[PDB]
């Protein structure tokens, strides 16, 4: 699957869609990107939506 990340706060705030196949692949990747750009903090995902969040 692919699957949106909602980055929200500090550095930047938006959506990157990474083609991340499965779940487990997508948390390892958000968590670099995200402690890449700044925003490392709390993690929130929705399923039907494709959606991860990384929340202050």
Do not use: P, S
Not at 26 to 53: I, S
């Amino acid at each position: 699957m692919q699957y949106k990340l909602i980055l929200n706060g500090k550095t930047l705030k938006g959506e990157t869609t990474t083609e991340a196949v499965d779940a487990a692949t997508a948390e390892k990747v958000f968590k670099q990107y995200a402690n890449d750009n700044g925003v490392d903090g709390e993690w929130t995902y929705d399923d039907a939506t494709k959606t991860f969040t990384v929340t202050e």
